[PDB]
Amino acid sequence: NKYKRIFLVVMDSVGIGEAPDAEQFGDLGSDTIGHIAEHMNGLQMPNMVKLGLGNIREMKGISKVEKPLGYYTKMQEKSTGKDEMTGHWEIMGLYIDTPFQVFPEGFPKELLDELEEKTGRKIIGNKPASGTEILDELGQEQMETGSLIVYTSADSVLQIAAHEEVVPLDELYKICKIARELTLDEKYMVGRVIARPFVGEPGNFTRTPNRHDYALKPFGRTVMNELKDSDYDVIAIGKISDIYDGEGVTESLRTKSNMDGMDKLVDTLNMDFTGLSFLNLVDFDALFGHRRDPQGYGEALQEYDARLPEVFAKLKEDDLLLITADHGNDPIHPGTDHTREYVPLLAYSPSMKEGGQELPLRQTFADIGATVAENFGVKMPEYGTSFLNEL
């Protein structure tokens, strides 16, 4: 092995400017990091700058350095969609023709009609909403009628809420399984169906930890699958295990925040493993990008950057750190959807004594997957070109 451990960090939604095909998606002008930097009157990310973020692209407060710690370039998404699954699945060596859909105006009547026909239940709601908002509005009617509250987020999900005393958990799970079957259809391709049971009285409803998720497996065996099958460790941190529906995962560490994500990364640095530690920092996307909150997004990026020196200190000569993103989600852009953007790529090992250089632009996110596979001597993915030898 060239490297014994690879630490892969997806800064979720942290895009570095509109991709060549951004027009198709209505994403002309999109620039996640750049617009955040302008909002902040300069972003304070000195550690990402030291790695060479500014060498990829100069933005307000983010300048190039003469000697970046590691190698740098950006990646272009090759798959059709810009959704949560597509980006991650491509990173791990796939190509995804069929995008997952989002539903800013709610689900098509055809889909909801079939769900009603199959379940014998009425559906109410059918809108994007937080768990709290939707229960405040509809919790009581749901309790009184035995209907189903169906709602969505800004991502590709169909959520079904029902009071635990009115709809038994096992019946709610059965319904979600029906909904999962109906949404494997490119007319309304849903990434994840989520059971959202709740308890309480009107004006005091709370969602319970009896949530169950119904996700799709990646459309192909991934580099994670190949690592696991070759007896390597694959440690998933945050939503990673969920994103891949556990495929190729040997250990999964739940996280509650970006700072907690960095704590778990540090935990894995302290573990003797051989293979991949794979972190998703999701706050950027979930709390700030979708909510179009550039101030909060900027603060989160500064908080993340300040955690990096400890990571640098713990990396060994045979460790490789890869930092990237999965799509954009520009907090100063119309609507609530992701933006089609290039993503940054930083590749650092303390064994890089002369520092790094610019890499050729990665024509698919799958170049990460290919690099990981080549490093560990496992079957190469169908897509992606390794940059291992460039490091």
Ligand SMILES: [Mn+2]
């Ligand atoms: Mn757009």
Ligand SMILES: [Mn+2]
């Ligand atoms: Mn994402």
Ligand SMILES: [Mn+2]
């Ligand atoms: Mn998202």
